[PDB]
Structure to design on (1061 residues):
């Protein structure tokens, strides 16, 4: 037979790889990723926390932005993740090597990260990345504290079994701001009904819609800024049209029901 | 200016050209592609696979196994020359689809568990789905399946974990000593004063001697061209495949010339 | 000052270590563990499945009983677990080395098994065993099939975050029998309320009681046979007074409620 | 039959569990373990390095001694190991959880550490401990640097496949001192000849005696202080009779040869 196909690279839109300067979200919280991939730096008194890292090739850019914020590589103490796909956990292994930071994640995210996103429930081996290990396993509702800032995990399975929202409270213009970093609620091209690899997918999504609606949140952020109507490119107006947690979940549930209609009706 | 896109590990088309099983000995078959070796050894208590080639080769391997009368669940063991993507590529998928166990030395195990990432020389350029080794083996250790004994010979250099495997089969009932020896190339490697591999030169030099000392009637290699095999024709037509001495001699001559150019 | 304490072994009641010959539970299902620890062998024409293995020192006994049942080590295909504590997953690492089995378990069980039971949420490092890796991660309700017998996973977290019940249909004198191997519902010495290492423990147990009551079950077995009133020592009469899923869950929940009340007000 | 045996804990000589206050070895190097188990703390301006940790139950003691040395848990950057048996790597998993330190080890030590010392080539499952992962895999001769102090690895397989000596240069009285922390060369109850799990054991031990003799060394230390004739209980006189690398390897090789002779006979 004809030769087997060549391996396929994980190519993404240029805006996902467009570097940007740090954009201040709150007094201690900064977007340091790219224009279209969120990576949040929280600077505490006893080191910095990174939430998500973006694509594999973004490790150097993250370290450069950390430098501009006054954070040396060894000052990064903790990495948290929304979910362990290649476009959000991509550079985690290299970040651990170059910073010594620990990774805290739930068990589902830990096992997916440790196999580099391979054998994905829905993508197979289509999107892999260098594997990394979690140094601390997190339970639902558990609180991780760095330098006086408490980060609370809220499991919201669906997009991945391990999908998690993280919440914390910063300050902004003299007042506290409850920040919620919620994972994706989409099911892009997923088989929703009767999926042998995820039998309770529909029940998990539906509960996760409700979990997101209930998060303590004055300011919602998402791994893809477009999903919560952020525009990182417009500077200090980046959050002008940012969605509430209610609007984010409702839009997600409406799309999910219609995606379920396209499937169930056939 | 956006960051660079990721690049896929692309190979010569003949590396990906399927072939029907080619008989090497009474129970030993090449079942990979024209230019990547994957050896199937059929025993009384199931099959052994030595290397799998590229990651996209899993289905092809299983199809050739079926043509040989080996159901997926009959694959009992996977052995490896070294844990690079073009030889260990489909190991994770093969484990999931067969239940086979992997046996490898510690160095190969850690690189396989990394999916080839953070390679001493390639960094993250040549990666593949990670897999775990179920049995760690030591230099000279014997693994027996169905009364066929496979002996490991460590030959570090191309990777720290590079291994040769030897076993005895028959050709029409007469015993034949088969040696499956890893690569001895250092493609683009910094040889002298490499911070990530300080004793590289010493290891290659010991490994040339290890290969020459292997018990061997027939030598095969992960890239058939490295031992003058032509998988396009029958195995008896490959009489003039290289001996262990000639294979190591050729590799040592290239290594010495590369070292000289680097020192100059 | 005084020397540090010596390490302490995990010692158990003698009956947990008392070998027994294989006891037929259904036409293809055998108890092959000890008098007071369940280890179920399910034999198909395409190989065997082992559900649990007991304590670490039981490996050789299990292999001896497999040989009496005509299962060569290479024909044990799969190991399933109720939960990853030393008295149920004890010999898994050794069994994997000595057989052709792979382990299928959920992510929580996978991460605890790979720690050898160390850093347990409730037990610390007091009850440990040789680490093993799960080869296949399974999801709630996922079906694993060996030789025509389908095994369905039902997550029932609480005793451990990864606690799982497994169900399958066998036959018993001419008629189908729905077997349920339900995990422990005990909370021995656990802090139930406001546990920073398991914040949703009470909610998980409460849901797990209902999960067990709903399992497809004509014949219940448990990792500790006493918990479902089996008496393996008497042979053919071992099942004569076995509990239903309802009675098992009701008994566990009555004890859980009294423990939580004790924790609420002494 | 009669019941199966109970599990048996790895109990040790109580002197191995006897806490001691930190003993200064050189200007930046301190013994912080117990009277009969070495655990070396190297303090730098960029954090600290721990070489070995002793038994599993020593984690709290190590951290208390670190605090006496001014090293907070988050100040520990790196853990190095001689070998991954329970009485030297015992508390590594707990130390990683409580400090955030990385582990650097060769591939053999990394795989043994990751299975908690289980399935040991010689001891089976008798000496298990909580497993840990290595965060950096190192090669023979590789240099790891923390705060300007360079640590070089020298593989000396035999006692375990992954057995490693670590060398670094410190100062004492304004002069360099080349410190060598060499692993065990013992073979306690080992089948030396024709061992199916370690076929080249004798060749590896013989090469490792030579490797130890060749180490750069003004001051030798060992995981068991008695093996290099240290006495940690006498403070400033602790090293007064410490062996050279030559003497240590010669004594170990003489013992090894007599052991091999009795086995062959
Ligand atoms: Zn995703
Ligand atoms: Zn995404
Ligand atoms: Zn290669
Ligand atoms: Zn190659
Ligand atoms: Zn338990
Ligand atoms: Zn139990
Ligand atoms: Zn030892
Ligand atoms: Zn020792």
């Amino acid at each position: 037979e004809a030769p087997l196909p060549q391996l396929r690279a994980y190519t993404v839109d240029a805006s996902w790889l467009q570097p940007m300067a740090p954009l201040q979200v709150a007094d201690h919280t900064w977007q340091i990723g790219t224009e279209d991939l969120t990576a949040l730096l929280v600077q505490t008194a006893e080191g910095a926390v990174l939430l998500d890292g973006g694509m594999p090739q973004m490790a150097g850019h993250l370290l450069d932005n950390m430098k501009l914020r006054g954070v040396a590589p060894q000052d990064l103490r903790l990495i948290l993740l929304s979910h362990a796909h290649a476009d959000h956990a991509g550079p985690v292994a290299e970040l651990k090597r170059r910073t010594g930071a620990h990774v805290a994640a739930n068990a589902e995210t830990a096992v997916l990260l440790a196999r580099g996103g391979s054998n994905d429930l829905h993508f197979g081996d289509g999107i892999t990345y260098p594997p990394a290990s979690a140094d601390r396993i997190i339970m639902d509702g558990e609180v991780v504290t760095v330098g006086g800032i408490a980060f609370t995990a809220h499991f919201m399975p669906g997009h991945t079994p391990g999908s998690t929202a993280w919440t914390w409270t910063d300050t902004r213009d003299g007042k506290p701001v409850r920040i919620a970093y919620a994972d994706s609620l989409s099911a892009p091209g997923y088989q929703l009904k009767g999926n042998p690899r995820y039998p309770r997918l529909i029940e998990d999504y539906k509960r996760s819609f409700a979990t997101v609606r209930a998060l303590p949140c004055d300011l919602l952020l998402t791994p893809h800024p477009g999903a919560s109507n952020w525009n990182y490119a417009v500077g200090s107006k980046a959050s002008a049209e940012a969605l509430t947690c209610n609007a984010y979940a409702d839009a997600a549930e409406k799309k999910f029901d219609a995606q379920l209609a396209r499937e169930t009706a056939g």
In short: The first helix of chain D runs from residue 59 to 68. The radius of gyration of chain D is 18 Å.
